[PDB]
Write an enzyme that holds these catalytic residues in place. Structure first.
Site, short mmCIF file in Angstrom:
data_model
loop_
_atom_site.label_atom_id
_atom_site.label_comp_id
_atom_site.label_asym_id
_atom_site.label_seq_id
_atom_site.Cartn_x
_atom_site.Cartn_y
_atom_site.Cartn_z
N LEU A 239 1.01 -1.10 -0.08
CA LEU A 239 -0.45 0.28 0.08
C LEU A 239 0.86 1.12 -0.03
CD1 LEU A 239 -2.34 -1.20 2.56
CD2 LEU A 239 -3.13 -0.87 0.06
N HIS A 240 1.12 1.97 -1.03
CA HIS A 240 1.60 3.05 -0.97
C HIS A 240 1.22 4.02 -1.59
N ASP A 241 0.55 4.55 -2.38
CA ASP A 241 -0.95 6.11 -2.10
C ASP A 241 -1.56 6.00 -0.98
OD1 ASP A 241 0.79 6.12 -4.63
OD2 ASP A 241 -0.81 6.28 -5.63
N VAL A 243 -0.89 4.47 2.08
CA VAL A 243 -0.06 4.67 3.44
C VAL A 243 -0.38 6.71 2.86
CG1 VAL A 243 2.08 4.67 4.41
CG2 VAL A 243 0.87 2.90 2.99
N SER A 244 0.53 7.25 2.03
CA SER A 244 0.27 8.74 2.28
C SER A 244 -0.55 9.56 2.14
CB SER A 244 0.72 9.42 0.18
OG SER A 244 0.58 9.24 -0.14
#
Ligand SMILES: Nc1ncnc2[nH]cnc12
Ligand SMILES: Nc1ncnc2[nH]cnc12
Ligand SMILES: [Ca+2]
Ligand SMILES: [Ca+2]
Lengths: 316, 317
Positions: A239-241, A243-244
C-alpha cells in the site's frame, strides 16, 4: 474539513486512494490534477474522470497536467505494473464528465492562491505539475498548507532499479525543485510503504466485504497483486498511495526525521533521493547545505495504518 | 602456513593502527605496502608507511609508492582536519632511513599477484586508484588475486565526506567502479558496518596503560583522531574503520555478508555513492546493475568479537 488537491497518475493504488479520500469525512477534495507515470497523462485524466463518476461526485474538477517530464520527451509508462489502461486492464467505457480547461499547474496555483495556507496537496505521481506551479508562481511553496509526497527511497532500494523509486525517476528535476522549494513537505518513501501490506487473505476479505467499491477495488488489484508476486515475490500488494493519504490525516501514525533532501538527475543514480539528517558537522559545504529541511517519514505504526485503510476500503 | 597480504593504504591514523596490527598477526605475511593519497598526499603516505616498517622492526618489507591523483586527475584535497598535516596526528617525526622500491604500487600489485597466483590477498584501506590501474594494465589480475578486502563505501547509510559518499570511494569513484565490476573475489566493508565498532575514551586510556609494543605511539596518534570524532560526529572516542576491514581478512566469520552487484556513481551530487543490487527483486528491464559478477558486502558485524580481536593486537607486547 481540510481542503485537498490530489495530483495523481491513476493507476491502481492511486484509484484506491481517491475512492478512500471521497469517503473520508474530514477531507474536502477540491480537485484531481493528473500526470503521467503509471499510464500516459490522457489515460490518467480518463481514469480520474471515471473515479469522480464512480464516487458519485462528477462535479469534482479534473485538471489535466503535463504530458512529459520537465527535461522533455515521451515518458515510459508502468503498463507492466498497472496495465495498458492504467487500472489493471479492465478496459472500461469512457466517462461522460469532462476535464476543466485550465492545466493542472494553473489549477494548483489558482486554488492555493484562493485559500492561502488552507489547501494541502497529496502528490501520488511524478512531481512535474507541482514543480511547474513552483516555477510559474515562486510564492506557491509558501501558500500550500502542506505537500505530502508519495515518492523516493531513503536508505532502501528503489523499484525502477536499485537507485530510484518510480515517481521520482519519472521526473527527477521536478522532484528536486519540490524538495528544495521551502514548502512544508512530508515525504513517504519506499522504506515506509514496503512495511504496509494487504496480503491475498486481506484482498479476499475486501472482496467478501460490504465496501461500496469492494468489487471494483478487488478487480483492479488482480493485475497489481500479480506484479508484486512476479517482481517482489510478495503474495498481495504494498500500500503506497493509501499510506501517503494516511500521512495526510494521521501523521501521528508515523515518526519523521527533518533533513534537506536532494535528487540525483543524471548518471546511474538518476532519480535517487538522499536526505542529510544533519547529525554530522561537515567540514565544508556540500549539495545539502543551505536548503530548508523537509519531513521524511522514518517509522510507521503498521497495525494503526492498516486498520485505517481497511476501514475506508470496506465502508458501505 | 602464513597468508600473503599486500596492504594498499593512505596512512593515516587508523591505517597506521591496521599496519602495526598486521605486523603483529602471526598467521599473516605482509609482502608489501602500496601507498595512495587520501588522508595525506601520496608522498606523505609513503613517508609514513616507511616509518611504520621501521617501527615494526621490518624495514626490509617493500613500500611501493602509488598514484599521486585519482584516475580522472587533479591534485587531491587531503583529510588533514581528520589525520593532521603529517597524516599521523601532527607528531612531525624524523624522516625514515629505509627507501621506497623503484616500481609503482600498480606494478608491484601485478608482479606479486603474478608471482603467487591465487595466494595473495589485497587489503585496500584508501582510494582504489592503484588497484584499478593494476586491473586495467593486466587483464588476468582479477582472476589471480586471492581476495580484495575493500574498506570503503556506505551501503544504505550516510557517507562521511557528505551524505552521499564515503572518503575512499569519493577519492576515486572511477577506480572504485573498475574494482567492483572487475570480477575479482571482493569483500566490501562500508560505513554501515564501521560506525558500529568503536574505541571509547576509556578504551583509549586502557591502550595507553597497556603493555602493547606500540601502545604509546598508537595513543599519541589517536589524540588528534579522537578530537575530530568529538567535533564532527559528537563521539567521545574513535570509530575503527581500517582495523575492522583487517578483521574481515582474518575473521570473516565475525560478519555476515550479502552478495550483489555494486556500482559507483561518478558524477553529480551523488559522486562517490556506492549502491548494491541484492537481486531480491525481478526487474522488468535491464539497468546499470545488470550482467556484472556480484561481490560480497559486509551486512552485519559481531561487535564484541571484532573489538576483542583489535584490542588483542593493539595491546600485544
Ligand atoms: N515495481 C514498480 N511498482 C510501481 N510502479 C513502478 N513503476 C516501475 N516499476 C514499478
Ligand atoms: N570524516 C572523515 N573521515 C575521513 N576522511 C574524511 N574526509 C572528509 N571527511 C572525512
Ligand atoms: Ca501513483
Ligand atoms: Ca585509510
Amino acid at each position: 474539513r481540510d481542503k485537498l488537491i490530489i495530483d495523481t497518475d491513476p493507476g491502481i493504488d492511486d484509484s484506491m486512494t481517491i475512492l478512500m479520500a471521497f469517503r473520508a469525512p474530514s477531507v474536502e477534495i477540491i480537485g484531481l490534477t493528473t500526470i503521467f507515470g503509471n499510464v500516459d497523462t490522457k489515460g490518467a485524466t480518463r481514469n480520474a474522470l471515471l473515479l469522480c463518476e464512480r464516487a458519485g461526485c462528477p462535479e469534482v474538477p479534473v485538471a489535466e497536467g503535463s504530458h512529459e517530464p520537465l527535461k522533455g520527451g515521451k515518458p515510459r509508462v508502468a503498463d507492466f505494473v498497472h496495465g495498458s489502461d492504467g487500472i489493471g486492464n479492465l478496459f472500461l467505457p469512457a466517462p461522460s464528465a469532462k476535464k476543466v480547461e485550465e492545466s493542472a499547474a494553473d489549477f494548483l496555483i489558482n486554488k492555493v492562491s484562493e485559500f492561502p495556507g488552507e489547501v494541502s496537496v497529496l502528490a501520488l505521481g511524478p512531481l512535474t505539475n507541482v514543480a511547474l506551479a513552483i516555477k510559474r508562481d515562486p510564492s506557491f511553496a509558501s501558500k500550500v498548507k502542506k505537500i505530502v509526497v508519495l515518492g523516493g527511497a531513503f536508505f532502501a532500494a528503489g523499484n525502477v532499479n536499485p537507485a530510484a523509486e518510480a515517481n521520482i525517476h519519472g521526473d527527477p528535476e521536478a522532484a528536486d525543485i519540490v524538495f528544495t522549494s521551502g514548502a512544508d513537505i512530508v515525504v513517504v518513501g519506499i522504506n515506509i510503504t514496503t512495511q504496509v501490506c494487504l496480503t491475498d487473505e486481506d484482498l479476499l476479505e475486501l472482496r467478501n466485504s460490504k465496501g461500496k467499491h469492494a468489487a471494483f477495488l478487488y478487480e483492479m488489484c488482480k493485475f497489481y497483486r500479480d506484479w508484486h508476486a512476479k517482481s517482489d515475490g510478495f503474495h498481495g500488494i504494498f500500500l503506497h498511495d493509501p499510506v501517503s493519504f494516511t500521512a495526510v490525516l494521521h501523521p501521528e501514525y508515523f515518526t519523521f526525521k527533518k533533513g534537506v533532501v536532494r535528487v540525483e538527475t543524471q548518471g546511474i543514480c538518476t532519480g535517487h533521493t538522499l536526505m542529510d539528517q544533519g547529525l554530522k558537522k561537515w567540514n565544508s559545504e556540500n549539495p545539502w547545505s543551505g536548503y530548508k529541511p523537509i519531513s521524511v517519514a522514518w517509522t510507521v505504526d503498521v497495525p494503526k495504518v492498516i486498520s485505517f485503510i481497511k476501514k475506508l476500503l470496506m465502508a458501505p
